[model samples]
Target: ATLTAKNLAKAYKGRRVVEDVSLTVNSGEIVGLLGPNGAGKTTTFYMVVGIVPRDAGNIIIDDDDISLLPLHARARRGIGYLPQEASIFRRLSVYDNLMAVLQIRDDLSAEQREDRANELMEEFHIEHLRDSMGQSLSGGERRRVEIARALAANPKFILLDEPFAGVDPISVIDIKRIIEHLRDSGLGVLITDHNVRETLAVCERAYIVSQGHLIAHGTPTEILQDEHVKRVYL
Candidate 1:
């Protein structure tokens, strides 16, 4: 499904944070949203995924207007989002947290969900933490678990914020591989991070936003080579 955000805007305390931002993401594509702090990157993400309401705009998925759909409805339509930080139930085992979300949609049986979670753990190379408590997981492990949990829903488009923020080099490589795999699987993926070099390396194109406006949009090479990006972020 194609995800389109047209003239999207959001404001807080009578101040516009995201202004008339528009973009389209097609199936099997990986796009990067890049910006400095307070550039409305997260606000734009929230509006697109229905985590927050937009003051004026249209969100259409595959030509279906879903601007008024509730958060759950949006999820049912196959939008998956991973915010800046993922929170898991401290007392629940890694397996249980994943199962809880899966069971809510009734998308899979208990056995099926468990198998899927385990499979993802193996894929992410985190199977050793399968029975670990959420609070005990390291930064890298938590990031992997969050991504695995999101994939469990089998979403059509995925929005990720700072997936590699605290991850080590090895974990970053693993995550990049997973993202490529997801894009190949026909899922539209959008990611944002303060680490421009890494995000650009993995994304096909990157959009640069500043002061609530889209200042640039192009392939990673184009963005990196742009005099504008260098002046603003370098």
Candidate 2:
């Protein structure tokens, strides 16, 4: 497995948000984190990526236990994430936004990182926005740039939270293509979205959660046919 979570649990104050949730993601697999609103999917992603602190449990990546690694350390060791809002620096140019991430991660030197960043931008077809400020780009353009920035480190595992939400139809199609390309390149992806039909179309396997506990898990087809899935998320 490229990424595994064992007995993962988290809570806010006295209320539990995620309970004993365990998942395994292998190389070249696209796993969908399916749930209705308030299903604790976003919190689970945050805990795995070292953003929101988890109350308990463990995360293993590539045979290493990273449950206690600092956020920066985890990022350095190849965990890439794109949150709901594509949080790039608004004041920076598109190229500079990626440059800043490279600088913070320190995975590659300035010159080499710029080359890689530009290459990814070109690959994602966002080269024209290189000089535009992040806040100025259109929704689709900014999303393409965000994916480019996430791949800057060539991460082996990636977490995408609500990637297709609020995106234009054409942009959503583009993003799905990018995700398929990434999976073909052997990256493990975990995507969460409310668009069950669309997500099922792209993801191989899926896990559905509700009220902080896992309700069902299986391939997209199986999940779609599950009783709980049909009753809740469907």
Candidate 3:
């Protein structure tokens, strides 16, 4: 399924944060949304995934109008989001965190849930840390688990916010590989990060935003050469 946001806008306390933001990610493509601080990238993500309400605009997923859907409804309709903070349950064990996802889903049998959790753990190369508490894992481990949890539902499109933020170099390589694997698997992926060079290396196309406006859209190479982007974001 393709994910599309058309003229998406949001505001808080009479201040507009995102204005007329439009973008698309089709299956089998990896897209990057890059912006400087306060550029409204995260706010746009939250609005698309239904966590934050939009002041105006439409979110379309595979021909369905999902602009008004709630978070759970959006998840069921195939939108998975990984926040910038790697928001895992700090008090829960790694295993429990994945299990909690399956529990909320409630569509899988116990055996099926176990199998799915095991699959994600292995895919993310975190099987050894399954029994560790969320707070005990290293930065890399936490990021892996968070991504795994986001993928547990096998959604059609994924929104990842700063997937490589604070992790070590080793984890950066591993996570980049995993993201490539997802793109190859035909899952539309949208990633936002300050790691411009690294993010550009992996994404097929990118949208550059500045101060709530989409400033440019092109291949990574084109964006790198854009004078406006160089001045404001590069």
Q: Largest TM-score belongs to which candidate?
A: 3
Q: What is the lDDT of residue 82 in candidate 3?
A: 93
Worst 10 residues of 1 by lDDT: 99-108
State each model's CA lDDT, in order: 0.85, 0.85, 0.90
Tens digit of lDDT per residue, candidate 3, span 130-182?
Answer: 88999998888899999999998878899999998889988888999999999
Please give the distance, in angstroms, between residue 96's alpha carbon in candidate 2 and its true position after superposition.
1.3
TM-score, every prediction: 0.94, 0.94, 0.96
| RMSD vs true structure, all candidates | 1.5, 1.6, 1.3
Record all residue pairs in model 3 with backbone atoms less than 3 Å apart, i.e. clashing: none
lDDT of 2 by residue, 18-109 (tens): 99999988889999888878889999998899988888889998779999998878877778898887687888898888787666546566
Top of the candidates by lDDT: 3
lDDT of 1: 0.85
In the range 100-198, model 1's lDDT, one tens digit per residue, is 767764867778877887787787777888789988887778887888788777789999898887788877887889889989989999999767787
- Candidate 1, residue 79: CA error in Å? 0.4
In candidate 1 the C-alpha lDDT for residue 195 amounts to: 73
Name the regions of candidate 2 deviating beyond 4 angstroms.
104-107
